[PDB]
């Protein structure tokens, strides 16, 4: 089990060798610059924002959603009626003698129904994503993934969405509640994740049992 | 699923500065708050019980 | 469903500055507050019980 | 997986300075909060129980 | 029961793509206004 | 159950490579602007 060959999360070499510097030019200057890579115009006082494809942005995942509903109804009805002639005078005998009019009835009806539902979800974290598209109005499509492996499994946190540039703070951060089409995923693998899956028979029963 | 429906007639001068009017200032106010799903069916009387509630002697 | 119906005759000088008048200043005030559904049918006497309440000797 | 869907019509003058508007200022607000997975299937009535809740005499 | 297909409360697409802006006119003004409504 | 292939919520690549900048024009200005939108 532990001897099965596996591919590590961080593949390839984990170190890099420095490349020896370019040969200095014989011009009479001490200042020698390596082959420049121009990164274009960069504003001086403007806050550092992602502007092009490949730029990075910090998303502060802070989700707190809670909805609830409940209702009930009831109805009741109770009715009792009675009449009794304990002593009947003679002139009334033919109309009320032999308990001819004595009667007693009762009835009841009751109903009580109720129902309700509620859902909630929270999410807290921080993830750095990359801009992979700039829209026609300047909004930036951002995607990002973080993979952490601790001991006996691997967890993935994936984020996607669309960010308005003016919602990004001065520290290159935007809360996750300001992203339009926010797709947030937090999953894992290993036997820890398989221990949180229903058995196939139990799922079959949960979906097809009469109750 | 729950539905809240409102209908009525509003006097323009009763509307506040924040574009709001209380429901007690609407002339022909029709207010409805209903739902569906098994929660709503659990609040309906059975047909036999309704029949008895309407036709029982007591 | 519940229905609240009102009818009457109002003197114009009894209406306040906020376009309101208490119901005790309306001449021929007809006020009705009724409902339907099984809740309302649960508050109706059975036909036999009503017959007894109207025709029983005591 | 949980889905929160929103739809509606927004008046531009109700939007605040921070590009925010409360959900009570949206005209035809459609709000949905649903989910899937065995957690969601555990909150569905069995077919026999639903049949009884809809067709039982009481 | 939970596998029965259903129509969601909010039907249709849940996102909209921005339409690219109109071509600016060659008049010597920076201010260019979209087709007013 | 856990071995059944599934499509993740966030599909596609989760990273983007920066595109190398445009070649600067030989006009005598340091300020070079990308193709404006």
Region of F10 on the Ramachandran plot (φ > 0 left; ψ -120 to 50 alpha; else beta) = beta
Q: How far apart are the first and last CA of chain A?
A: 40
- Please give the structure tokens belonging to residue F19: 């595109």
**Cα dist. A56→A29, A132, A201, C29 in Å?**
37, 10, 45, 72
User: Other C-beta atoms within 10 Å of D28: how many?
Assistant: 7
This structure's resolution (angstroms)? 3.4
The answer to whether residue A206 neighbours chain D at the CB level (below 8 Å) is yes
Rounded to whole angstroms, how far apart are CA atoms D19 and C32?
47
User: How far lies F3's CA from each of A145, A191, A199, in Å?
Assistant: 22, 11, 12
Picking from F16, D13, F25, B5, the residue whose alpha carbon sits closest to that of residue A131 is F16
Interface test with D, best of E3, E10, E16, E37 (most D CBs within 10 A): E10
CA distance A68 to chain F (A): 26
d(C-alpha B47, C-alpha A18), whole Å? 85
Q: What are phi and psi of A148, to 5 degrees?
A: -120, 130
Tokens representing residue F21 in the block: 């900048």
Contact A147, A155 (CB under 8 A): yes
Residue of A nearest to F7 (CA): A185
Q: What is the largest CA-CA distance in chain F?
A: 66
CA atoms within 13 A on the CB side of A65: 17
Return residues 1-37 of E near D (CB < 8 Å): 1-2, 8-10, 14
Per the entry, the structure determination technique was cryo-EM
* Residue-by-residue DSSP string for A32-54: ------------SSS-----STT
Q: Specify burial of residue C1 (Cβ count, 10 A radius: 0-12, 13-18, 19+).
A: exposed
Cα separations in angstroms, A71 against B5, B39, B42, C16, C41:
17, 8, 10, 39, 20
Query: Do E21 and A136 lie within an 8 Å CB cutoff?
Result: yes
Contacts of A85 (CB under 8 A, 6+ apart): A92, A96, A99, A101, A102
């Amino acid at each position: 089990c532990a001897w099965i060959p596996a591919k590590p999360l961080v593949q390839g070499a984990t170190t890099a060798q420095p490349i020896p510097g370019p040969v200095p030019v014989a011009n009479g200057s001490i200042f020698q610059s390596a082959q420049p890579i121009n990164y274009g115009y960069q504003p001086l006082f403007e806050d550092r924002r992602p502007r092009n494809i490949g730029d990075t942005l910090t998303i502060v995942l802070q989700e707190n959603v809670s909805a609830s509903k409940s209702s009930s109804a009831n109805a009741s009805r109770d009715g009792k009626t009675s009449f009794g002639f304990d002593t009947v005078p003679r002139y009334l005998q033919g109309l009320f003698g032999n308990s001819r009019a004595d009667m007693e009835a009762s009835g009841g009806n009751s109903f009580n129904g109720k129902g309700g539902a509620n859902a909630s979800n929270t999410f807290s974290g921080t993830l750095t994503v990359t801009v992979d598209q700039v829209l026609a109005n300047g909004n930036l499509h951002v995607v990002g993934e973080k993979q952490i492996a601790i001991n006996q499994g691997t967890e993935f946190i994936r984020f996607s969405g669309v960010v308005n540039p003016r919602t990004i703070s001065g520290s290159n951060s935007v809360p996750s509640t300001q992203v339009a089409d926010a797709r947030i995923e937090y999953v894992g693998n290993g036997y820890i994740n398989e221990a949180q899956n229903m058995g196939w028979l139990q799922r079959f029963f949960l979906n097809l049992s009469p109750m």
